[PDB]
Symmetry: D3
Subunit: 292 residues, 6 copies
Amino acid sequence: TRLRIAIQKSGRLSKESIELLSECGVKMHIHEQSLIAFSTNLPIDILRVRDDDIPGLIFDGVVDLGIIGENVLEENELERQSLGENPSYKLLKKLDFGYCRLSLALPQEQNLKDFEGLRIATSYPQLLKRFMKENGINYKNCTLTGSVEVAPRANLADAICDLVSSGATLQANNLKEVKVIYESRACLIQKENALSKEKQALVDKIMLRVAGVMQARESKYIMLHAPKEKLDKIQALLPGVERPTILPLAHDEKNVALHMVSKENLFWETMEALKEEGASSILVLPIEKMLK
Amino acid sequence: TRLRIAIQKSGRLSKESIELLSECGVKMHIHEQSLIAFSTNLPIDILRVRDDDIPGLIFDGVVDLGIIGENVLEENELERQSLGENPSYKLLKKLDFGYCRLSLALPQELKDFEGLRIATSYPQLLKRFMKENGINYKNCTLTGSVEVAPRANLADAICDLVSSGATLQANNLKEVKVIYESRACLIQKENALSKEKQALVDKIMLRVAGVMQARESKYIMLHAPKEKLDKIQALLPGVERPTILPLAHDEKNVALHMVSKENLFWETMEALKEEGASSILVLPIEKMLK
Amino acid sequence: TRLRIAIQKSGRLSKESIELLSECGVKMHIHEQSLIAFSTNLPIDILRVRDDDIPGLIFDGVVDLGIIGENVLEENELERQSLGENPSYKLLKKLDFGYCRLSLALPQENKFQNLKDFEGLRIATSYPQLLKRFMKENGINYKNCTLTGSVEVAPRANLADAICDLVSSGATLQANNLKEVKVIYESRACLIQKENALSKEKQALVDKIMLRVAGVMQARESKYIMLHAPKEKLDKIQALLPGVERPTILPLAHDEKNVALHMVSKENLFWETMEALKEEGASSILVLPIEKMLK
Amino acid sequence: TRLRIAIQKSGRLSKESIELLSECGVKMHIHEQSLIAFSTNLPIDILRVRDDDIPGLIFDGVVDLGIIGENVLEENELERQSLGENPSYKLLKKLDFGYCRLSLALPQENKFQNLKDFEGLRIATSYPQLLKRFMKENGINYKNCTLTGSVEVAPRANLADAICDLVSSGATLQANNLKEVKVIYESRACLIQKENALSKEKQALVDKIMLRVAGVMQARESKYIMLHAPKEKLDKIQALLPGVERPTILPLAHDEKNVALHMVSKENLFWETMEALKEEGASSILVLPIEKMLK
Amino acid sequence: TRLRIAIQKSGRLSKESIELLSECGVKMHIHEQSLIAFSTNLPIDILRVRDDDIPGLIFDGVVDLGIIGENVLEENELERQSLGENPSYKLLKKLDFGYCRLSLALPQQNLKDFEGLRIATSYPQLLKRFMKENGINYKNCTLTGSVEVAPRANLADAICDLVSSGATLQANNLKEVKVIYESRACLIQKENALSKEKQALVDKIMLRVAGVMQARESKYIMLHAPKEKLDKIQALLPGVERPTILPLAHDEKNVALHMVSKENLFWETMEALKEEGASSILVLPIEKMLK
Amino acid sequence: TRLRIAIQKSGRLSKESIELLSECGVKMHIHEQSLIAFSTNLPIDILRVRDDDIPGLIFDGVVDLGIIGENVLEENELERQSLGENPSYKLLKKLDFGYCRLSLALPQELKDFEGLRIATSYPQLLKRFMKENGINYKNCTLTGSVEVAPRANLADAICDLVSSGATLQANNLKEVKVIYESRACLIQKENALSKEKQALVDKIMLRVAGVMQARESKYIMLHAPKEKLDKIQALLPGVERPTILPLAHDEKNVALHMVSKENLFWETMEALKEEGASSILVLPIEKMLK
Ligand SMILES: N[C@@H](Cc1c[nH]c[nH+]1)C(=O)O
Ligand SMILES: N[C@@H](Cc1c[nH]c[nH+]1)C(=O)O
Ligand SMILES: N[C@@H](Cc1c[nH]c[nH+]1)C(=O)O
Ligand SMILES: N[C@@H](Cc1c[nH]c[nH+]1)C(=O)O
Ligand SMILES: N[C@@H](Cc1c[nH]c[nH+]1)C(=O)O
Ligand SMILES: N[C@@H](Cc1c[nH]c[nH+]1)C(=O)O
Ligand SMILES: [K+]
Ligand SMILES: [K+]
Ligand SMILES: [K+]
Ligand SMILES: [K+]
Ligand SMILES: [K+]
């Protein structure tokens, strides 16, 4: 049988989940009508489903791997625990996308006790519940799967417990963030029961590549020209991951090419200082995978 | 404040819920981006939400009315009971759309379900039914595409919502047991409404009944010889008795009008013609009141 | 040549404009890519364009008729007048759709809020010219923020302090924590025609269409009511449901005591007296549609 | 087994085919992903497919009924005949929708243009087989350019010199600077059935449906007219609006001078005599829909 | 006049065709309504049409080049031959996308097991030719879409269906029995000679197409290793010719080594490279490669 | 407060504007419903609006930066000047996308425009040009489909935006006069920014230059005999001079690397092979700094 991986059918995670699988060498033809997309080059089946189903599919052993936000994973874990079940899974990797936080927020027109008795709208009723029990606060519930941010101005609720990627989003609905109750990111998870030897080996291969993809994010390959005499000064500004590669230029004994891996943001931050030190013809090139 | 009604944002019930509101006199401009559509002529706000949210909004008193399938309503009632809560609501009316049933099905190739993985969108309904019948099974919850699960080797069987027997046969599945029958309902929250809101609900309910009573009925008109009245009346009696109308410069023939269920009309149409009926017209009826 | 009519390509007006033309006997095949849809049964070309173009096409005589909101029409009339031009058109009919109003609104304060409270504010709107005229007439100064869509977001996103916005319902503003302070313009859809006379044949076609437009308008919100009642109750029922002139009375087979009565009624009035009709002995009451009514 | 009917998946005929089945009492849930929609109240399966497949499915007996344009039906019939096969089917009914024609057209020149002007030209079309037969019959040679869509663009894009195009309106060609020169085929929607006899129960179901289809067709374009007039004017009004048979005459409450008159009329004839009805004393004129009419 | 190229209007094939033209230096603005997109930098017109029209446009000389699957090309060639015509074209290049196969499949078993069955397919002409040659009789069911549903919906007994993956059939409870046709995208040209200037433009494009094709699945690998390990690493990752060797700053023990590699071979030897002392290994894209 | 940048919501520029911001280090989550997208890593808000609004938002100081075509910018500048206002803005950079021209065209069948009805989306640019040339004409403003106007008999001629000469010829129109040439620009409002906002703009501009300088350039690598260095250098000089790299166990051949414009590379590629170049690679370059 083939390895089954469940990803979000469409949405935030979906594009990034697909891109990640593609960079890990999985080729597939995705038809928006089909539940499953079959890999053309590897024994892998990609299930594209509603995000909320993914944890359950992993807990129940229906699929082997899943990519899902920690928030959705924990919300569902809690729902199942409170129904008396014992869900389990293996965390393989916390990914570098899907960054967001779950925040209690009130109208700008302030404290945690100010939430006592309020109606609070959320898509994550279970995370909200646990947090309010732990802090001894009573409140009335209003579960909406979408458009939570509109609830207060539409007079459906007094406050919200909303997922945001940016502080500014709340301010732009005249809401003040009061307490962050959960921080999340996309994870790659695996079901509890051991896989067959061949499936596990395939998972291991994929993980090597996942690390390579993750390690390269935000990094670029920098090339420049400088006088040999300036090597030490430039190296101090742009050290590389180990040390600069040094390359001769044709018919030139005074100048060299230097190559270094750098985080893109650090490069821009020292770019003008590199020029002051005599660097010229500076190139930025992409890197798709990095292995330490 | 305005009366809040929650309906399905898009889908099976969404079109019918909107149509029904429109036939009940509610005018509104629906923008697919907004959560709320405000009625332009009445103090009513229509919330367009995911179906699965509607029961919760009614249980928690966030909205006043909802239109939702019995299946989704009961699934969510069960989930809340099993978390120890006590959800309540008022059933106002079982509606004439949204008919479907939840059915256990197996590949063509009840104790036969013991130990199987069963895919469903309604895990809680499935659970209750299998407890009541002492059957153990493994779960596979999918929100869409449950019918694919067996042929894709995700599960051995399904507990699927269907509107037609034939759908299962066309995925090489045999229906084995119907475990739930559902249809659209209009429901209201438990806590009493204000006097003005309740009066508005009452008005709407009079019209809803009118809409429901007229479904499948048509106004039939025809010409016949006066001599044939009795024979035609026996074929098409009307809701009370035929209206009889003179025709210009004619003493031998008349027009007759009667309400009829559309299916009964077609069933007796040829016999009406054999009895001398001609120029037969079928007109729509939008509301009927007893 | 064929008569040209311009309607909104997509949107609020758009569905209703098409429906109206269809009820006036115009059959056509609408392909979402084409500028023009040609009528299959009449010499009429329907141009489907951005709403904002329609007034200009009528002013410049490019098309013969148009269906457009008064608000868009006047905004564009003002823009052209302020560029020194003299736009003109014929108003044929105000239609029973596209109702909305243009309203100054501010963020809610639990207080009486005034027109002077707009002095110095940045005000977002899609109708800068209507806003401008109104604020000159009331001697108020303000800063401008023209957005073609999403005006209601401007205050909460901190792009502006206030808005001048099109609303169909009072409640919409309340639901963005905005208080309607002053209605500056009321609008509905209109059918308009260019200034320069049409050819005799085109004008005759317009006249035909107008007869039907009136028939469509006059029937909106009306229904044909039919019911059974005892003859003895005629006067009491007639007082409750008078009809457009007087009830039609129709015999029932083999019955001298009861009759059928038919009357046209506004749907809302019918529902308002429905229970009283039943108390007076009415039964098997039917509501049927009416597509056109002519006085 | 259930009766199988094939209709166009999306497009021109698609909406009308579905509407027609619905008016014939077939209830179904149509999901845009599925090939088949199953009727919820009758033993009928609706296949929604590409139009070009339908004739083949009927010819090969895969389905029992189909709704398809004559043009597509004949194009496919010809293709199969020229491959040596013998396709057959039963025509049940020609429907009142899908009207269009296939026309040879050229770029406008300031001159009279004719059929011999096509000799040697490259002619773009979606119906190569209908074009071929017509040009053989008229002894004209030409070069082919088959496009499934956008045939109207071929001349201006310099892909071809001329076209043989499907149009619903004369004006569409004029509006691409093409002159219609010869109509080579006229088409409309048809309901067809496969050659091999159906089971008794399936055939009885087909027969039921056909009774309704006729009722639907006979009512198209007809309305139920009601009005008030003085009894004295009956003869004059009857001459203007005779009805299907003769006017129904109905008393009005407490009135011996006026009556209500009801008559079925084609909508167009009604509008054509409407003003004359008013001149003869008609008032409160109503137009009501009719869904089915049976002779 | 400008060079005309026909490509699929929409579908997966459409995107790869556009990407390929873009990597060959053709810039254009594509509006989903227009038949034609005009190149902004070259005298080229791109026609975006239904796939099934492309062979015909080439056969009839309406356009100069086309990108189309072999399956669709041969299906239409056969249809035209059987109507007595003589279609011709030039094959310029078999491309590196659009791989699929046309397979007879039955519900979950031989070729003789197809005798007398109704077989659904979108390629009736390919199916016909194959069954004549093998002396098998069968009844036809032509569907342009959803062929895989035909057996379970009881429209047919079997199918002759295009597939990109073995697993797709197994997931509809169908067993692949015989592959009757293998296909991939091709670049083709009409039969009649082009003008000198158009043919020269085609030739330029072809040089780039080859460069694009030769680079697919290859990456530029860079790493650090001790000078002492050069031979062992070279044996694991030989490069297209031989590793480039580069000094590192203030270091006489270690060097950087660069080599082109097929991506799959790289991953297959990656851990062995690390065992041999490789570190800071980078994978970089390559857009074109020329021999 | 955060820096506000306005870009086209959807359209020609829209994708390129987003790409350019992304290459300048702005990460964001773009939901097609929202007016604003907030940058996740920088204090920047991206407003996605109709193109025609962008100049106004800059002139009125509502936003800090905008990306817009010169054509739309000047059309709106003119409209505002003719209403008596004084719009101003700072041009930061002419970008390398959005190239097009506004051209008077007639049916194939300048004084020839006197008295004609001329359709256009840019009435104000047309007006100014015709005043300057003393020509009278009648107007027909359409926001879309201007090219259809003559064949549909809505106008006699057009003043249309085109990216290619061939587009007009393919509607049987002849280009007669180019009246305006445009490309996308990055512009900024007139009133000074806060020190911190201006510094952020300056950072972004350094990157924008890097992006622009790299467009159409590639990093070329190849093998050649050491003896052929001079001949190859003359064919492919690099931006300064070729990098030269030893190959393993080889004293006769070397690797050479050079930056080149992609078109010049293809133009000399066969001559490089004649001179003994082999294993030639083309790699992308994302930014180049002088
Ligand atoms: N030597 C440079 C670049 C490089 C890494 N790996 C290979 N080359 C660095 O250490 O960053
Ligand atoms: N008298 C007819 C029709 C009718 C009902 N109500 C009014 N008219 C019947 O009893 O069916
Ligand atoms: N006589 C009824 C119904 C009617 C109007 N016109 C024809 N019939 C009324 O006046 O309302
Ligand atoms: N008596 C009218 C209306 C009618 C037809 N059928 C029943 N009523 C006519 O002959 O047209
Ligand atoms: N010399 C290395 C890298 C390279 C190829 N071409 C230029 N450099 C190899 O042969 O793979
Ligand atoms: N030295 C080569 C490549 C290069 C530029 N910058 C760094 N390396 C050139 O001058 O084009
Ligand atoms: K509020
Ligand atoms: K014309
Ligand atoms: K079956
Ligand atoms: K299977
Ligand atoms: K041309």
